[PDB]
């Protein structure tokens, strides 16, 4: 669910800066990207593409796809490294179908882990023996994991 604007406003008579009324090509709409298709004054191939409804809708569909791409790439705190089949963990020793090939696969339902394998992200400090066997100096420190059974401040002791 997203509350941003996706469609372009239609064509009518020339709007004015009023209450609940913005001009059709303004710097506020779509982050100022309408300056490519705006007219300041209140050459035939360079005038008619600004007034075609299918043409101005396709450009917003490109700009909204650019906004969809940059937020999907800013979510990536990981990267894809081709790891061979022998040094991979036990949940990746299975036959993994490609994207949109099968049902979205659970990781391992036998161990009560119902999650998609395609969104599984492994920490880099776990695979130091696989990714860096040539260094031999432990370039990344081990992850300090907190003791869940230790009496701490959250357990009133």
């Amino acid at each position: 669910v997203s509350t941003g604007e996706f469609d372009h406003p239609p064509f009518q008579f020339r709007q004015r800066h009023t209450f609940n009324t913005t001009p059709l090509h303004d710097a506020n709409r779509f982050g100022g990207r309408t300056a490519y298709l705006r007219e300041i004054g209140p050459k035939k191939q360079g005038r008619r593409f600004k007034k075609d409804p299918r043409t101005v809708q396709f450009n917003v569909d490109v700009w909204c796809a650019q906004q969809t791409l940059r937020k999907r790439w800013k979510q990536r705190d990981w990267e894809v490294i081709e790891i061979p089949f022998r040094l991979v963990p036990r949940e990746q020793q299975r036959v993994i179908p490609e994207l949109y090939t099968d049902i979205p696969q659970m990781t391992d339902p036998a161990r009560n882990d119902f999650s998609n394998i395609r969104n599984k992200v492994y920490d880099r400090e776990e695979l130091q023996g696989v990714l860096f066997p040539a260094a031999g100096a432990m370039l990344y420190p081990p992850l300090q994991r907190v003791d869940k059974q230790a009496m701490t401040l959250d357990k009133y002791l």
């Binding site: 004015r16 800066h17 009023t18 209450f19 609940n20 913005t22 506020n28």
Partner: protein, 154 residues
């Protein structure tokens, strides 16, 4: 504020006749309360504007009964008495919004639109980067760049 174009003014009776569309839109009316709640003042003309328009939208689909005839003009004049009372309250909140948001804009160093008066900074209509190169109503040429209403450092 990124709306710096020249604008067209509307009479206040055309604003309130929109009703739930723009004047009493609930997303707009709740952020007008947060302006008054930040400054520590009563939202008293705003709440009584909202209580009236809450009940006005409740019966707005009902058709009025046919006025079959009265010898004296009593309930017709009384229904118009309450109707002209509801407009004067919403005339006050229409003035209360425009007074306070121009007082807030003088504090936050935010420049208004064209030909807009802020009482603390620019008593005349502040015009910045207009299509017409001179003042629209004061008949004076605009300098380049735009007029600095505030000091420099943030």
């Amino acid at each position: 504020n990124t709306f710096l174009t020249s604008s067209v003014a509307t009479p206040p009776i055309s604003v309130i006749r929109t009703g739930p569309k723009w004047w009493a839109h609930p997303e707009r009316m709740v952020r007008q309360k947060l302006m008054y709640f930040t400054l520590g003042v009563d939202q008293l003309p705003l709440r009584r504007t909202a209580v009236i328009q809450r009940d006005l939208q409740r019966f707005h689909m009902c058709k009025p009964p046919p006025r079959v005839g009265d010898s004296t003009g009593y309930k017709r004049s009384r229904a118009a008495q309450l109707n002209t009372w509801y407009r004067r309250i919403q005339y006050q909140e229409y003035h209360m919004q425009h007074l306070f948001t121009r007082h807030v804009w003088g504090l936050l160093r935010v420049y208004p639109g064209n030909t807009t008066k802020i009482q603390g900074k620019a008593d005349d209509g502040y015009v910045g980067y207009d299509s017409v190169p001179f003042h629209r109503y004061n008949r004076a040429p605009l300098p380049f760049p735009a007029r600095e209403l505030y000091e420099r450092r943030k």
